[PDB]
């Protein structure tokens with residue numbers, strides 16, 4: 001497909017590893033630092049400044065302040081997940097609604113078959129086929145964050161022309177306890 005043939009011509013492949021210091025203590029980051037799961041109960045970890053202590057989130061180890069970047073995430077048969085980018089300076093302690101105005105540009109799935117963008121208010125997406133693997137694409141200078149079905153190239157959603165002022169991290173959120181993890185592809 002053109003998607004596979006061109007992605008690297010146009011966007012720099014990000015090698016995203018999950019930063020265990022950022023991860024909500026209810027989350028487990030795998031040893032290879034590419035997959036996240038949820039525990040039944042919050043594990044015993046410090047409340048260091050980088051950790052999300054309320055939202056069930058985890059960040060990439062590296063952020064972006066320019067250029068064009070992409071990574072792919074195997075969502076598989078998970079019933080719930082959200083992925084995207086966020087500002088370095090988001091509120092990590094206590095609640096904030098996950099929205100562009102709070103520095104989060106995400107979308108995902110809930111209740112097995114409801115695809116949404118996490119805008120204010122949420123808006124529903126209509127996807128012909130459920131995706132298994134989702135590509136997340138950032139162009140910092142144009143302001144676009146776009147999501148594609150990584151297996152067939154079809155478009156899922158684009159946040160257009162955001163005027164970014166901070167560094168941006170990949171972000172991943174899982175609310176549910178299910179057999180299937182959320183996994184980054186290298």
Ligand SMILES: C/C(=C\COP(=O)(O)OP(=O)(O)O)CO
Nearest residue numbers: 054055056057097098118122173
């Ligand atoms: C409790 C929780 C997430 C749910 O947040 P919200 O209740 O704000 O809902 P959503 O529209 O899915 O963001 C932990 O990240």
